[PDB]
Amino acid sequence: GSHMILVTGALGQIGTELVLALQEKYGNDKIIASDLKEPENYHCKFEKCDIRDIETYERINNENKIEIVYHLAAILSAAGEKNPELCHDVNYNGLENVLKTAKKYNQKLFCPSSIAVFGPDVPKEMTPQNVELNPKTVYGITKVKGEELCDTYFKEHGIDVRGIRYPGLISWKHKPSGGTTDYAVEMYFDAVESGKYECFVNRNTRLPMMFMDDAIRATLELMDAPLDSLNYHSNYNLSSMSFSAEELEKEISAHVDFNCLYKPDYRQDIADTWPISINDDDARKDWGWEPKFDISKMTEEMITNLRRLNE
Numbered sequence: 631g632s633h634m635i636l637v638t639g640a641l642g643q644i645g646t647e648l649v650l651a652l653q654e655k656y657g658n659d660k661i662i663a664s665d666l667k668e669p670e671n672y673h674c675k676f677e678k679c680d681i682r683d684i685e686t687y688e689r690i691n692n693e694n695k696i697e698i699v700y701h702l703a704a705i706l707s708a709a710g711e712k713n714p715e716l717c718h719d720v721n722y723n724g725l726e727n728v729l730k731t732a733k734k735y736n737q738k739l740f741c742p743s744s745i746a747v748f749g750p751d752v753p754k755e756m757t758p759q760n761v762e763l764n765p766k767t768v769y770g771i772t773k774v775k776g777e778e779l780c781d782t783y784f785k786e787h788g789i790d791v792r793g794i795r796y797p798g799l800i801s802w803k804h805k806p807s808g809g810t811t812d813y814a815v816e817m818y819f820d821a822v823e824s825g826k827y828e829c830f831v832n833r834n835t836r837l838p839m840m841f842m843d844d845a846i847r848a849t850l851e852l853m854d855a856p857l858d859s860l861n862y863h864s865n866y867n868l869s870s871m872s873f874s875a876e877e878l879e880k881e882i883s884a885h886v887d888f889n890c891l892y893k894p895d896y897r898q899d900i901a902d903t904w905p906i907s908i909n910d911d912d913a914r915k916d917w918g919w920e921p922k923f924d925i926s927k928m929t930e931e932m933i934t935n936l937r938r939l940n941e
């Protein structure tokens with residue numbers, strides 16, 4: 631086959647790093663990036679597209695002989711509370727476009743979910759894989775519907791679509807976009823840049839978090855697993871860390887001097903409805919998941935690179 635891979639949402643937090651990992655794994659000639667606007671200074675072949683534009687999306691897939699899509703395009707939780715209609719449109723109708731195309735062209739898919747599928751009616755601690763999904767955000771609802779649609783494509787249409795309920799992801803290669811979990815990223819950036827941070831959640835806010843290298847590795851490992859080994863498809867729980875905002879402040883302060891003030895905003899109301907930690911036994915059992923970055927190791931990577939960038 632062509633062995634060609636498309637990454638939608640390629641310019642975002644995950645995509646910035648996933649494109650590189652896929653180029654190194656498969657060879658640079660095998661990877662096509664797509665997002666809304668063509669970037670200036672960019673070492674991957676790029677095809678612009680709105681994920682809602684089925685005609686152009688199909689054309690990109692056809693012409694490039696795409697066999698595998700890593701579908702990252704989305705509107706996230708905080709933006710989705712501000713703009714519910716946009717969130718539904720982009721997330722649900724974009725996903726539907728991706729799945730319909732996969733069925734036409736016999737594609738394999740990665741379509742991620744989020745811990746935002748969970749609401750406060752199920753356990754906050756070590757949330758199980760199989761509990762009711764009654765999210766309290768628009769975004770969470772889109773993700774629940776998306777899990778279900780993916781699993782319908784798998785069962786009814788034979789599409790090998792896989793996905794992870796990512797926790798909050800922390801990275802330094804992309805500027806923070808002010809998402810709900812972005813207080814962890816921003817705290818690092820602002821600590822190193824200015825020695826001060828105004829945190830938009832309260833000091834005890836405690837969410838499942840993961841360093842990007844772990845999330846990217848998890849994504850690739852899940853995609854490489856034999857299909858018959860998977861007991862879940864669109865929606866693996868996935869865990870690494872669970873810490874509060876002040877715990878992160880104390881970790882960062884062991885390395886860098888900084889003033890952290892807590893001034894919650896609307897994003898608190900999102901975070902408060904999510905679990906603190908996640909039971910990912912099924913990922914660990916079915917496909918060998920184990921995280922490699924604890925808070926100390928992640929902190930060293932973040933601070934070292936951010937200090938370099940601030941030279």
Ligand SMILES: NC(=O)c1ccc[n+]([C@@H]2O[C@H](COP(=O)([O-])OP(=O)(O)OC[C@H]3O[C@@H](n4cnc5c(N)ncnc54)[C@H](O)[C@@H]3O)[C@@H](O)[C@H]2O)c1
Nearest residue numbers: 639641642643644680681702703704743744796797798799
């Ligand atoms: N980063 C996290 O902490 C996290 C956590 C859970 C789930 N996820 C999921 O992972 C995926 C990627 O997340 P991310 O953090 O990289 O998001 P992001 O916002 O950084 O990237 C999403 C990309 O989608 C693009 N996009 C938006 N609307 C579009 C449209 N109409 N057509 C085409 N492209 C469009 C944006 O331009 C952006 O580059 C999403 O499915 C998200 O729900 C992320």
